Amino acid sequence: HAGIFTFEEPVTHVSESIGIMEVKVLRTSGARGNVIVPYKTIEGTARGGGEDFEDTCGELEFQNDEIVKTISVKVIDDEEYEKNKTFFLEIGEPRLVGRPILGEHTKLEVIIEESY
Ligand SMILES: [Ca+2]
Ligand SMILES: [Ca+2]
């Protein structure tokens, strides 16, 4: 009963001026025990390392009966006019600290919409 872990949706649009994007990870079908869920950002046409966004990777620890957590990603606005750019987040194999598992949405494409 350890849970099935998922993003809300596989694609999201955010403004280049959003500042901080807050991405949710949901636990469904069971909330028993402490579970570690790895996550990471991956570049698309948007560049990481603090250029278009800040690299954000690590692990979420869900406590017993905890069913939602947040990954906060810094999205960096600029003064250039360009096309919309993309990056990704992924969640990795969950582990107890009966097994927890990944659910429907395990890769998320973020489309950063030019703010002008
Ligand atoms: Ca930029
Ligand atoms: Ca821009």
UniProtKB/Swiss-Prot annotation:
Disulfide partners: none
Compartments it resides in: Cell membrane; Cell membrane, Sarcolemma
The organism sits in which domain of life?
Eukaryota
Query: Where, if anywhere, are coiled coils annotated?
Result: none
Residues in Calx-beta domain copies: 1-92
Q: Where does Ca(2+) 5 bind?
A: 16, 78, 80, 114
The annotated consequence of residue 78 to V reads: Abolishes regulation by micromolar Ca(2+)
Which residues are involved in binding Ca(2+) 6? 52, 78-80
Tissue expression, as annotated, is: Cardiac sarcolemma (at protein level).
Q: What does this protein do?
A: Mediates the exchange of one Ca(2+) ion against three to four Na(+) ions across the cell membrane, and thereby contributes to the regulation of cytoplasmic Ca(2+) levels and Ca(2+)-dependent cellular processes. Contributes to Ca(2+) transport during excitation-contraction coupling in muscle. In a first phase, voltage-gated channels mediate the rapid increase of cytoplasmic Ca(2+) levels due to release of Ca(2+) stores from the endoplasmic reticulum. SLC8A1 mediates the export of Ca(2+) from the cell during the next phase, so that cytoplasmic Ca(2+) levels rapidly return to baseline.
Written domain comment of the UniProt record: The cytoplasmic Calx-beta domains bind the regulatory Ca(2+). The first Calx-beta domain can bind up to four Ca(2+) ions. The second domain can bind another two Ca(2+) ions that are essential for calcium-regulated ion exchange.
Q: Which family does it belong to?
A: Belongs to the Ca(2+):cation antiporter (CaCA) (TC 2.A.19) family. SLC8 subfamily.
Name used for this protein in its record: Sodium/calcium exchanger 1
Organism from which the protein derives = Canis lupus familiaris
What is the covered span of the full protein?
Answer: 533 to 717 of 970
